[PDB]
Amino acid sequence: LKAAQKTLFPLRSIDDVVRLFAAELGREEPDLVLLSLVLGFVEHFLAVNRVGLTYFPVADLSIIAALYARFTAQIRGAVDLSLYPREGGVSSRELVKKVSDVIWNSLSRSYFKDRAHIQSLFSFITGTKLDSSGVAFAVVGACQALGLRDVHLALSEDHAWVVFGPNGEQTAEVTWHGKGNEDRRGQTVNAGVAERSWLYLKGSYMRCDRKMEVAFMVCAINPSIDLHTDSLELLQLQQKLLWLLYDLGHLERYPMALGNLADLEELEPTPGRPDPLTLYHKGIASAKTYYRDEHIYPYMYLAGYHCRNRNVREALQAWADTATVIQDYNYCREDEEIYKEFFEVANDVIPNLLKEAASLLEAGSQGSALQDPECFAHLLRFYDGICKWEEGSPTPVLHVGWATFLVQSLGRFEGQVRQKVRIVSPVLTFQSEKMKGMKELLVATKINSSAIKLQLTAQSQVQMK
Numbered sequence: 112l113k114a115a116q117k118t119l120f121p122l123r124s125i126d127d128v129v130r131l132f133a134a135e136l137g138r139e140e141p142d143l144v145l146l147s148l149v150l151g152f153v154e155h156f157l158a159v160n161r162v163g164l165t166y167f168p169v170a171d172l173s174i175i176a177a178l179y180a181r182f183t184a185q186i187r188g189a190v191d192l193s194l195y196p197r198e199g200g201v202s203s204r205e206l207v208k209k210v211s212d213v214i215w216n217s218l219s220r221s222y223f224k225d226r227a228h229i230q231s232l233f234s235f236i237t238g239t240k241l242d243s244s245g246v247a248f249a250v251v252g253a254c255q256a257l258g259l260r261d262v263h264l265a266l267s268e269d270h271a272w273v274v275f276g277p278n279g280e281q282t283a284e285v286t287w288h289g290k291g292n293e294d295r296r297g298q299t300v301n302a303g304v305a306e307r308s309w310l311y312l313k314g315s316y317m318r319c320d321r322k323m324e325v326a327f328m329v330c331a332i333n334p335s336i337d338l339h340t341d342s343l344e345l346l347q348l349q350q351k352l353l354w355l356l357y358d359l360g361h362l363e364r365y366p367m368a369l370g371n372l373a374d375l376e377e378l379e380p381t382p383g384r385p386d387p388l389t390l391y392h393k394g395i396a397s398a399k400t401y402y403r404d405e406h407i408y409p410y411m412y413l414a415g416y417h418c419r420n421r422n423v424r425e426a427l428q429a430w431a432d433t434a435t436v437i438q439d440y441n442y443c444r445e446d447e448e449i450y451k452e453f454f455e456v457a458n459d460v461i462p463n464l465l466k467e468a469a470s471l472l473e474a475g476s477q478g479s480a481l482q483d484p485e486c487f488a489h490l491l492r493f494y495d496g497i498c499k500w501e502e503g504s505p506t507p508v509l510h511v512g513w514a515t516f517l518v519q520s521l522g523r524f525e526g527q528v529r530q531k532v533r534i535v536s537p538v539l540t541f542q543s544e545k546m547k548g549m550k551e552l553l554v555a556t557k558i559n560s561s562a563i564k565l566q567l568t569a570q571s572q573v574q575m576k
């Protein structure tokens with residue numbers, strides 16, 4: 112720690128922590144190790160153990176400096192840079208793998224990896240525990256500590272790894288993904304980009320600079336005390352740090368951070384700031400502008416907001432837009448998190464929304480989504496993208512467990528509404544062969560459930576006897 116990094120201590124409040132972030136973000140190289148330790152320290156005493164808490168856990172310089180010393184001693188002790196000559200001011204694959212091994216070999220032999228509050232370097236030092244993306248972050252913090260300015264965090268919507276080397280063009284796995292998959296640490300991500308999985312976003316993943324890595328640790332704050340309770344202090348801190356980053360420009364290329372800020376603003380709006388909808392739309396604009404509109408979550412964030420607000424029309428449109436992105440992916444081994452999300456939207460969330468909409472229609476609601484043929488078209492476009500996703504995939508998506516919910520959802524719209532959508536080869540065009548073959552079935556007053564099921568699962572036969 113340099114003299115200038117120390118002058119704000121002790122940190123006595125949320126605003127003092129924000130001041131420290133502002134100061135670091137004004138430097139050439141914000142100090143990831145310092146910032147992650149401070150966040151982990153304040154999170155430990157606001158969410159993990161609040162015994163004795165009277166306002167805010169004061170972070171004394173002595174305490175934080177000792178944690179920082181533990182981390183830098185561990186890294187500098189274990190990684191001898193003389194063994195890994197740096198040409199071009201760039202790092203080698205062997206050096207990146209060594210740092211990843213140092214972090215990985217340090218971790219407790221046995222612990223649940225999905226635990227809360229194991230994301231920061233405070234957890235690494237005090238508990239020898241990190242979650243999956245926490246290991247990638249720690250590798251980047253260790254590399255910055257070692258002077259390796261070219262090593263940066265790479266992020267998809269469900270995984271993390273690093274970029275490094277000449278022009279920052281090399282990739283390396285540094286952590287695990289999911290449960291029960293084989294370690295691939297040290298390898299590139301080329302095979303996953305080549306196979307067009309969601310996990311590697313067809314190459315349209317985030318390549319962070321240092322300020323984006325600060326944004327990542329701020330998104331990683333976890334205000335959860337337990338299932339029913341959040342720390343208001345940590346929510347306020349995370350929200351203020353995100354606004355600080357937004358104002359500086361460091362969320363411009365970070366759609367998920369914008370969605371996370373929008374969500375926070377929905378919970379507790381900051382006077383004089385953009386509405387949550389404005390922020391969700393900024394996250395989609397970021398995904399279009401910087402990532403070829405190949406991210407799924409910007410539309411999921413927007414749809415979730417509309418769903419909570421029971422804006423059925425806008426929620427369906429945003430889920431249809433979500434499906435329009437996924438249709439150009441192949442469903443691969445390790446994409447299960449986004450399959451679970453689509454399955455929940457199709458098979459639980461939409462059915463519950465339309466069920467309430469049907470009750471409200473019975474009670475004489477006007478302008479109901481269930482009487483709007485554009486909403487029926489959004490529902491059909493959502494299924495169309497899911498069917499098209501499945502085409503050419505190494506792993507199928509649909510099965511009969513989806514068919515009953517599709518028949519129920521279609522049936523929530525009366526035949527006179529459904530008839531008004533023109534399906535062309537309100538107007539809708541299908542991309543998937545499954546939906547094209549279903550077109551015939553979509554306007555009958557009583558939908559043919561068995562034929563729908565046959566078409567959705569492309570199952571060959573009916574029952575023998």
Ligand SMILES: FC(F)(F)Cc1cc2c(N3CCN(c4nnc(C(F)(F)F)s4)CC3)ncnc2s1
Nearest residue numbers: 244266267268269270271330367408411412415
């Ligand atoms: F690094 C990994 F491996 F953990 C991948 C990352 C995830 C993630 C994130 N998330 C994940 C998505 N997430 C969502 N919460 N709601 C979502 C939506 F379904 F409503 F869209 S998506 C929480 C924040 N937020 C900022 N940055 C990142 S980087």
